[PDB]
Paper text:
[name] is a tumor suppressor E3 ligase that has been reported to inhibit breast cancer cell proliferation through 26S proteasome‐mediated degradation of RAC1. Here, we report the cryo‐EM structures of monomeric and dimeric [name] along with in vitro biochemical assays.
Through 2D classification, we identified a G‐shaped [name] monomer and a circular dimer in which the subunits faced each other in an anti‐parallel orientation. Global resolution was 3.9 Å for the monomer and 4.6 Å for the dimer by gold standard FSC using a 0.143 cutoff. Our cryo‐EM structure shows that the [name] homodimer makes two head‐to‐tail contacts between the N‐terminal AKR domain of one monomer and the C‐terminal [name] domain of the other. The N‐terminal helix and the connecting loop dock into the groove of the small N‐lobe of the [name] domain. There are two interfaces present in the dimer which constituted 2421 and 2418 Å2 buried surface areas, respectively. In our [name] dimer, the N‐terminal helix and connective loop occupy the putative E2‐conjugating enzyme binding site of the other subunit. Superimposition of the [name] domains of [name] monomer and dimer reveals the movement of the [name] domain C‐lobe by 17.2° which in turn causes the catalytic cysteine (C876) to slant by 14.7°.
Residue numbers in the entry:
A (entry chain A), B (entry chain B): 1 to 385, 442 to 901
Amino acid sequence: MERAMEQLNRLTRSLRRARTVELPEDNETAVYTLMPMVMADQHRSVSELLSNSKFDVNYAFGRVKRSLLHIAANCGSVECLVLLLKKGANPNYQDISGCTPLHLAARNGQKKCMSKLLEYSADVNICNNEGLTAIHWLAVNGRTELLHDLVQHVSDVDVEDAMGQTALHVACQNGHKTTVQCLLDSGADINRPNVSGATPLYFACSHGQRDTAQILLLRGAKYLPDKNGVTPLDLCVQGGYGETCEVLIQYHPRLFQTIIQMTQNEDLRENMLRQVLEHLSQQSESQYLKILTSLAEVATTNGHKLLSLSSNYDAQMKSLLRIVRMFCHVFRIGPSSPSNGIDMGYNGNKTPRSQVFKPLELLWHSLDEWLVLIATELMKNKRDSQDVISMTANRLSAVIQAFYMCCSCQMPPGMTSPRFIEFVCKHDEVLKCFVNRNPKIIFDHFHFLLECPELMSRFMHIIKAQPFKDRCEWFYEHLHSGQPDSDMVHRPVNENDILLVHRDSIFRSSCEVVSKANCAKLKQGIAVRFHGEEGMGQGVVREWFDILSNEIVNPDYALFTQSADGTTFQPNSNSYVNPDHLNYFRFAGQILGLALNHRQLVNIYFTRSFYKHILGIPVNYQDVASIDPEYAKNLQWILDNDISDLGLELTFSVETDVFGAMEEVPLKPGGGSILVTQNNKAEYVQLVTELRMTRAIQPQINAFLQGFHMFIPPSLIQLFDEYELELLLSGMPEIDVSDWIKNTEYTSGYEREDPVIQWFWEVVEDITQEERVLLLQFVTGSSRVPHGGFANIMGGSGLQNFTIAAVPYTPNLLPTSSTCINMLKLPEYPSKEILKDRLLVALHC
Amino acid sequence: MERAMEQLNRLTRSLRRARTVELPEDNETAVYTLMPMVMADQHRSVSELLSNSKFDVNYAFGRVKRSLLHIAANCGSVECLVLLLKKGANPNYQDISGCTPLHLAARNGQKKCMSKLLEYSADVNICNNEGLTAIHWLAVNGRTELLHDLVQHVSDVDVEDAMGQTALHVACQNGHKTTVQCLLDSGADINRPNVSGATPLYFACSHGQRDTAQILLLRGAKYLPDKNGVTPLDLCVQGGYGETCEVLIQYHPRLFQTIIQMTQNEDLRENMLRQVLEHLSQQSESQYLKILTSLAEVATTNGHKLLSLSSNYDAQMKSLLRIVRMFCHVFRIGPSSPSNGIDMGYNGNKTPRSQVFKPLELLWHSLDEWLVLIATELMKNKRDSQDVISMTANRLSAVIQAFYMCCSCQMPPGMTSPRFIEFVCKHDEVLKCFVNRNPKIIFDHFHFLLECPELMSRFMHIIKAQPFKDRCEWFYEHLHSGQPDSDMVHRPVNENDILLVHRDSIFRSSCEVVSKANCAKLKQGIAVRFHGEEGMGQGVVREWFDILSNEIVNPDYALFTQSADGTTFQPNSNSYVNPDHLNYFRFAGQILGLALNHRQLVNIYFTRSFYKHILGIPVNYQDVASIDPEYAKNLQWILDNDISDLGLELTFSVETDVFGAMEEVPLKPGGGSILVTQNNKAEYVQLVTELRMTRAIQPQINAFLQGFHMFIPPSLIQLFDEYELELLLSGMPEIDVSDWIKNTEYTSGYEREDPVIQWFWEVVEDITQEERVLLLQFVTGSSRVPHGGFANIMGGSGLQNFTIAAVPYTPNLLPTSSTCINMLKLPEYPSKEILKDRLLVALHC
């Protein structure tokens, strides 16, 4: 009969909202309704008509093949969970990844399921095929409360992955508290060696969990190395964190010495040691002393042992520096307080210096014990001057580097001790005797001993004591290195190495651009752009300079002029008319400052005065000649004469006919109140020159350098000679001896028939280009022959090719090059060997 | 004798600082010392020993060949300037560019030089070979003071470039005051026709110099067109500035009408007219009226003249809109005050409406005079229904577009007048009769008449009145256009169309990404990136979606489930457990929202309910069947029966067994206090359904759409049918009739021997793909056959290939597809033509 509808007649009336019929005859259908309702947490609904059914739970679903009993892990359906277990189940199934509802409850954080599951039970000691246990699952997650609420059910703390890790091994690898105390309360093993022999502790010293480690050593946790032999402590280094060591050392003060041993080694990136020592140094004064004290002893030891001659030059030496460099750095931060860094409040100290520095004093005394002998040895070796000398020199070279390092920190910034100088006072001989052997060297050991101008304030001395001929291939080092100082050999990078130029007004526009940027972004071969247009990288860069190669010397802002030669330039004294000029002078040197760093020439060259004022020299007498010959020619006549002869005196105040005013102005205060002494003849005119400069040069020159020194520091340049200097502004010349032969002019009734000229050419045609280029400028001032060759020489005004001038000028005297006359004046030597020998004496100087 | 040194013996003593000897015997030397000293402004120094010399000034220098007399232009060396002119000179030389020291003094701003030069004189009427005169040089620079101080020397104001420009022509082309008044005071010509006939005034109307123009028309400056015939006034338009016109019209009120004539034209970018009219409208109320009034008359005229049938469809129509569109825009800014914009303070007005709108009223009355007849014509044409009809329709179509434009501005935003509706009330017949002819059209004229839902709040009406068969190639328009609404056919661009994804957590990561951006940046086929890695543009984009094609339907956050069919999805009702879900639902639609805009499928498809809740439909009865058959099967049995039969009633409060509570809850307040009426049988269960939805669907659905509508507005979609909808989510299917033939299942003791099946296939194999795809889903619900073909069908649970079912089900009735049974139930038609004809009646519906 149709009474089968009667159950539904109840369902429709009052249960159709909640439920359907449990007679679809497919277990897959049952999940298609229950799978929500399980997750609905419909506690008893699941049972209501399920009271009739023929579908057991051991059948599962999904590609996982997972039962709803697993699913109940998710939403906390504890009542349905029980309802399932009234039906029965084997919860720790062979799930696809070795999982189980228990693990999944933990992941879902349903407490009561874990409880009610474990009011029943199924073995937890099981694992995933991926490795983990229930307990390990919780340890990484650090799921404390359930995990403490879990231990009551379970027997063993020997639980392990098949790999062997315990929960204990996890919680410090991850970093966590509570997992400790429970298992400590449970009585687990503290050393519990891994398969590799590692320990729970061994993790933490990789980690930085200072506080647990404070508990464990309190708890009595043992210290010991790996099965391989390494220590825990080598790791807390590479973790960089030092309070964890500070915690460690409260439990083991013994090991403080070990760090002094860990630094002798060389396996490390040294910087990490600084992190540690930086911190600890700021953890006591009494520490801070004993630290430095101990270091010096090591330094002192290795110092002696570098002089233990068998020591390799590599081993001891590198060990040394790594102690010293920090030692220098530590003193910068400086005398610590207990538990704290540098002693605040009181700027002095408790007289540490002897206690800390005594081990040095023996080494330096020991150094002195060698060096003082050594001066005797090489100096006494008078008739006769492998090289143990050069060997031992190198060993000491490291030490010589120390003597700046040890010394250059207990002084304000930049300033040196005269104690350094006193060292030089005794050993000056030997010091020359090294560079006598080692031209190759300065930028390695000595690199900074030069660098100080306050030492070069004397040690200009040795810079000259090494003469010119050695400087050539190291004049080249500044080219085929970067500048061999490492900040200049090296080029940085930045995310925006780009500048945008406005094309029609590059002279003022670039001033608006480059002023709007900072040095470090610009200390690089940066690419350049137009304003709103690309420029093909290097292309616009070529355009940008070589346009500025015009704009700079164009009278675009009333800025420069040509000197008396023509074919060159010198700044206009009158550029103070328009006050922005200094912004252009600062700008000017910056632009050139790039030109040399990245080493493409400029299509400009300048007179001699300008290079000289840059490079820092007091300009000599004869440079005057390019200003006006009628001035200089007659001053030369004065250099023969004295006050006794000429029957005239200089009024030491003269009409400073400048700025539309014959400004009566003295030579000098005090200088205005004297008459000419015979000694003064060149000396005031030097001052007239400098005072011919000061009116426009002095402010403007400084403005120019301060823009210039951005891109090269002033002191790298001290090698260079001003004559050679332009070669990086212009490249080497094509030495055009061929076209030179073509247009040699001759005077004094004079043509190549003269054997003097035959003897002349015979010397010329064996001369190095390193001297031919000098002679070219020595007599022209300017350098470059035009594009076609030496025939293109125009003399500025009238095509005066170069002239060779021999005259009855005394053989007892040296030449003078009538420069803008494009001429060199020479004495007629009597004979060949006299010419061939003494013409060299004439020309080299 | 050596007494020649005596002059220098004075020089050294007291003049060597200031001077040298003037005997170098080269005039080029003299410049090499003086060229500074000239610029030094050494007033008298230049003369001192120059008193003896043999070098005249007419010799010059540089590639310019320029004298120091020119150079004195620079620094104001008036005394030296005179000193030169004591020596004599011809200052207006044939300089290289036709220049002269006078021009150069002006450029350098040295007043006295200009004075002292012109205490002497040389003809200023000369010019540059580049074109300019002295006076023109000053005009552009606007160098007033010297220029006023200049006129006293000079005779003519007829001065001109050889091109013919006067100073007067310059100063307004550039914009400047003072040059006017001086020459006005001088008595220059105000019209002064150029070679092209242009005038000084003619420049200003290109320029915007309102104030001079205020002076000139005050001064009596004449108005007149070009030699070509164009006006000044056409330029002040394209300069966009209107007060200059406002200045103009104070002097010429007559021309106010001309702008009404300038807008009829079509040479212009219309926007500039808005700039003008925007301003002027805000320059009086009485203006503001007369403006709109005049416009309507033009509109009214052109309106009639569009109905002057000879008018081309292009000309009058475009003229119209350009009046109306502004007219609409003007009212937005709205009723102006005198001299000012919109009347502040009082939100009403002075009753403008009839005065402004009357010209419309005739046109619309005139429109009504046509349309009311026109309904008669086409409707009375009853036996018999080129096409002047379609022609005149198009003409009116423009007008029909007006009727929204004229109407949709005196109302708050979005809302319409029922006056519009009243128009439809009379003309509904004709309105259908157009689209009856014009399927092709809506997005051109009507585009917005649809767009209003408040009009579609009725005009849903005509959207259905046009039936399905027309929608196919315009269902395709949304594909082979963008969406044919222009904002969607068009894609914007931005400088950063880039998003950065984090690869291992794309589901939550992308939520962190896309929430961190704004719509307009994202309304584009934007490229995508990984976090710290590139992704090959389209590649990661494919990866990003097609990973999300998994992540979305993965139970990754407890979000979706599979529906009863399997092989599809529906949202989990239980996703309210974890409150961020709405952020994912909003997120969800956004992600899909891109998928359709840029038209690559998703590797997902959904059930029918989900599409229906999206698209805005009230879900029908039979969609229920995918939820539970045991529910739906028995409700079907109820649809045969009524309260009279079944002997049962629904308790209108039932156990809402949800959230672990048999929540006794009514059907509805008021619904809970009734018993079943026979009419109610489907009606409450609809409400049960919607209330089976509301518990989870209602909040979540809205969250999903609000993320979705970002990338398509809701109303573009109103064309679509939900069945066809998925094709843009999945692409068209490979219609696999071949493999379909291979695995056709058969039941009711039934195999292809039956002629019914022969008659079946005979109909099937002529069916369009546009209907075959429907039938596939009509009986499967799901769409896609797996990769290998129709043989891969798995039925979800048990490989139930599709089944064809014919039964003694009455021929008087239509099919029902037992869908997840993969079956279609059909009546056995008695004969072939009955099958061939009436099976169509069965299947199309």
